[PDB]
Amino acid sequence: MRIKPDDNWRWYYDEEHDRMMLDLANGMLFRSRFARKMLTPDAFSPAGFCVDDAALYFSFEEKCRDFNLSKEQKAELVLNALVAIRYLKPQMPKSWHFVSHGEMWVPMPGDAACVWLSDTHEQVNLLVVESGENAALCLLAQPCVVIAGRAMQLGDAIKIMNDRLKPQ
Amino acid sequence: MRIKPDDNWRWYYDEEHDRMMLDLANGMLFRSRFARKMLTPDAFSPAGFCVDDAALYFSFEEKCRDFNLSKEQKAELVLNALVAIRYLKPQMPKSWHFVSHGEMWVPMPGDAACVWLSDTHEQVNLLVVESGENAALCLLAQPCVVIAGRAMQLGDAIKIMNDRLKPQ
């Protein structure tokens, strides 16, 4: 495997570029997708990467093996998922942008999900990171997409309603 | 191999942390050893990692395979070499901190070199990154050392006189 979690990793908030980061260490850094706006007040205090984060990392890594992405992309995808799980504030679920399915499906963390955009009918691929019973928090699991007016790229968060999500 | 140069790599200087970086991309960043003080005015303008850089990367990587280091440390070593070659200002060669050898040897870029410290006789490993006929730019190729009063760690530049350098 390409990157392997190590005792030396540190989460820290970068004041100047306004983004959660991981120190890798050894000259390497990972700048996540998430800025102050989206972090819980935990985030603002450096913390070691712990066994629990290691564990989530290993599961996510395997759950993503078969997504259609560069192994560099899979890494960024899984590292943002840890940031989201650990530090993201609660999200306001989105509904009406996506083709609705008459049944609700229970989606588990680590699942590959599609939604359909209700105007373009373009399929978009997500990774599920957190469940709920109405809403599921997902990360965008493809290089980019345009949603409301907004553009988003790989790693970006969005809470979607379970009736809009579907297995790949 | 693990890190592979990619069209999306960008050199840029980071105003806020005063260091030359490389964007890797995919969330990954590399922070080199080198601050404003040591850069040619080129540095202050972002630039794609180009085919020539890619070439230097590949020879330096191979010339460092058998150094006594972590593959993470070899990565940091080589990346700093690239910064050094591309962007470092001319250096003032040092002389007197190192055990002299009555003959001058010709050292090629890419070479593994030792200097001896003249008071401790401790051996220190370097990586040659530029040649000249008197002076040869080297990066420190071991985790850390103490030289004049200064500390230095892996990736740090110093220009040394060729009579002071010796092959591994």
Author numbering:
A (entry chain A), B (entry chain B): 1 to 168
Task: Share the article's original sentences.
In this work we present the 2.9 Å crystal structure of ZapC from E. coli, showing that it is composed of two distinct domains belonging to the chromo and Tudor domain families. Although the fit is good, ZapC contains an extra beta hairpin (residues 141–154) that is not normally present in Tudor domains. In the Tudor domain of ZapC, the extra beta hairpin (residues 141–154) covers the very hydrophobic pocket that in canonical Tudor domains binds the methylated lysine-containing peptide (K36me3, cyan peptide). The structure of the ZapC crystals described here contains two monomers per asymmetric unit. Although there are two other contacts in the lattice, the one shown in Fig.2C clearly has the largest interface, buries a number of hydrophobic side chains and completes the otherwise open beta sheet of the N-terminal chromo domain forming an eight-stranded beta sheet across the two monomers. The dimer interface buries a contact area of approximately 1500 Å2 (out of 8900 Å2 of each monomer). Given that L22 was mutated to proline, we think it is very likely that this change disrupts folding in this region of the protein as prolines do not support regular beta sheet formation and the side chain of L22 points into the hydrophobic core of the N-terminal domain. To investigate this conflicting evidence, we probed the direct interaction of a peptide derived from the C-terminal tail of FtsZ with ZapC by ITC (isothermal titration calorimetry) and obtained a KD of 32 μM, as expected for binding of a short, flexible peptide.
ZapC has been discovered as a non-essential regulator of FtsZ. It localises to the septal ring and deletion of zapC leads to a mild phenotype, while overexpression inhibits cell division. ZapC has no clear homologues of known function, it is 180 residues long in E. coli and is found across gammaproteobacterial species.
